[PDB]
Amino acid sequence: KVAWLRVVTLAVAAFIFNTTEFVPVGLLSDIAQSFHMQTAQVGIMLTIYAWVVALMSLPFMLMTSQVERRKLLICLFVVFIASHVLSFLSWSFTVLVISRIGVAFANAIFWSITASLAIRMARAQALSLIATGTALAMVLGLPLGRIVGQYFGWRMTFFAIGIGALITLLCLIKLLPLLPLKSLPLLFRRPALMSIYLLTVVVVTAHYTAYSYIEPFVQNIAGFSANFATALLLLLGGAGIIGSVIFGKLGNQYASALVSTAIALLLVCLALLLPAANSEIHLGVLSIFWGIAMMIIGLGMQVKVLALAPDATDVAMALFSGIFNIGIGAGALVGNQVSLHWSMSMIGYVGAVPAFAALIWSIIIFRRWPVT
Numbered sequence: 200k201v202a203w204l205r206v207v208t209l210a211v212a213a214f215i216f217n218t219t220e221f222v223p224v225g226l227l228s229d230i231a232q233s234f235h236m237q238t239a240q241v242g243i244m245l246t247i248y249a250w251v252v253a254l255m256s257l258p259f260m261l262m263t264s265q266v267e268r269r270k271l272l273i274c275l276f277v278v279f280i281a282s283h284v285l286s287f288l289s290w291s292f293t294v295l296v297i298s299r300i301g302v303a304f305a306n307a308i309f310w311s312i313t314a315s316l317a318i319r320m321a322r323a324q325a326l327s328l329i330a331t332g333t334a335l336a337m338v339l340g341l342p343l344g345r346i347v348g349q350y351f352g353w354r355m356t357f358f359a360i361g362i363g364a365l366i367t368l369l370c371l372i373k374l375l376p377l378l379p380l381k382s383l384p385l386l387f388r389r390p391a392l393m394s395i396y397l398l399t400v401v402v403v404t405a406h407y408t409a410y411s412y413i414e415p416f417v418q419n420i421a422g423f424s425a426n427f428a429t430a431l432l433l434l435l436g437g438a439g440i441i442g443s444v445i446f447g448k449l450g451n452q453y454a455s456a457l458v459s460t461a462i463a464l465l466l467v468c469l470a471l472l473l474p475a476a477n478s479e480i481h482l483g484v485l486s487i488f489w490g491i492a493m494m495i496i497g498l499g500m501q502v503k504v505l506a507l508a509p510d511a512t513d514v515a516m517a518l519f520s521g522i523f524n525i526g527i528g529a530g531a532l533v534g535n536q537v538s539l540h541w542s543m544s545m546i547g548y549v550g551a552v553p554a555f556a557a558l559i560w561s562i563i564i565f566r567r568w569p570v571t
């Protein structure tokens with residue numbers, strides 16, 4: 200009953216925390232406009248947010264292992280809210296980026312403890328309540344947040360996100376009850392696990408070289424309307440939900456085959472992004488594949504990480520999330536460079552290189568370790 204109420208207030212927080220990671224992709228120009236930059240330069244806020252989560256997610260999780268979670272959640276929420284107020288009234292791109300380092304700290308801690316808190320209250324579908332909040336962040340959180348950005352501006356988008364957290368924080372204060380390192384070398388010494396981390400960083404770099412700049416790409420390269428970009432992002436968000444269900448149905452026994460097929464499919468979408476940019480329905484139909492491909496890739500490797508480190512899922516997850524974010528920041532940076540020094544239309548072809556590498560690498564490591 201109220202058990203459900205608290206797992207539910209956890210899911211709305213998941214949705215809120217994931218939406219703010221996502222929304223900069225759909226406010227890049229709006230943000231660029233307010234600070235007089237080209238849209239690609241704004242990509243630095245993505246790199247910098249993702250690398251701070253990466254370098255901190257494993258350290259943060261350890262240092263906060265002895266803190267009771269209700270006290271922990273409140274502090275991370277306070278940091279989160281304060282940071283979004285700071286994004287709203289930020290007086291320089293530098294101040295905006297500094298606010299984004301603040302939200303990165305809260306996110307890093309927040310994803311440490313949120314699955315554990317979901318299972319503590321009654322369980323398997325208590326966990327799916329946290330995932331569906333992520334899911335909603337994808338198909339609703341990012342698209343709606345862009346629409347708010349277009350009407351009210353990007354600052355109000357960040358301001359609204361913090362207010363929602365604040366409302367969520369208060370529900371958590373009423374609803375929450377009292378909530379009372381040596382694995383790295385062993386995990387390092389598992390080449391099958393290390394190979395998945397390697398795969399993860401390469402393939403995520405591939406995807407985010409293009410995905411980070413899809414908004415300026417759609418409007419300034421494909422030259423479609425601002426509202427076409429918003430629809431594409433809902434397609435991608437809904438395509439991700441689609442990929443999420445096929446994986447959930449066949450992932451436990453076809454994860455390797457699913458991962459490599461999805462990587463092949465992602466490679467193909469990257470290479471055909473600029474060619475498909477002349478037809479709005481080609482881009483829209485491409486993005487449906489793109490969205491399906493990338494979410495199957497991400498969950499397949501997450502399931503490999505679990506299958507390879509059941510003895511230490513916490514640090515393995517902290518490691519997986521960390522290296523996943525390194526690929527996020529690398530994708531934005533490479534995308535940033537291809538856009539500034541070459542052009543944003545090669546964004547699809549440059550992302551294709553590492554996606555190809557990752558394909559071959561996936562094909563190799565699944566031959567070498569085929570039973571999980």
Ligand SMILES: CCCCCCCCCO[C@@H]1O[C@H](CO)[C@@H](O)[C@H](O)[C@H]1O
Pocket residue numbers: 253254255257258393396397518521522
């Ligand atoms: C080419 C070397 C092989 C790389 C394979 C990646 C697994 C080892 C990297 O772990 C490191 O752990 C640190 C924890 O703070 C972070 O800096 C970041 O998570 C990550 O880099």
Ligand SMILES: CCCCCCCCCO[C@@H]1O[C@H](CO)[C@@H](O)[C@H](O)[C@H]1O
Pocket residue numbers: 401404529553556557560
């Ligand atoms: C952070 C992105 C910059 C790194 C460059 C991406 C390449 C990493 C892919 O791995 C390598 O691809 C080789 C191609 O020959 C394979 O032969 C080799 O097996 C494998 O080690």
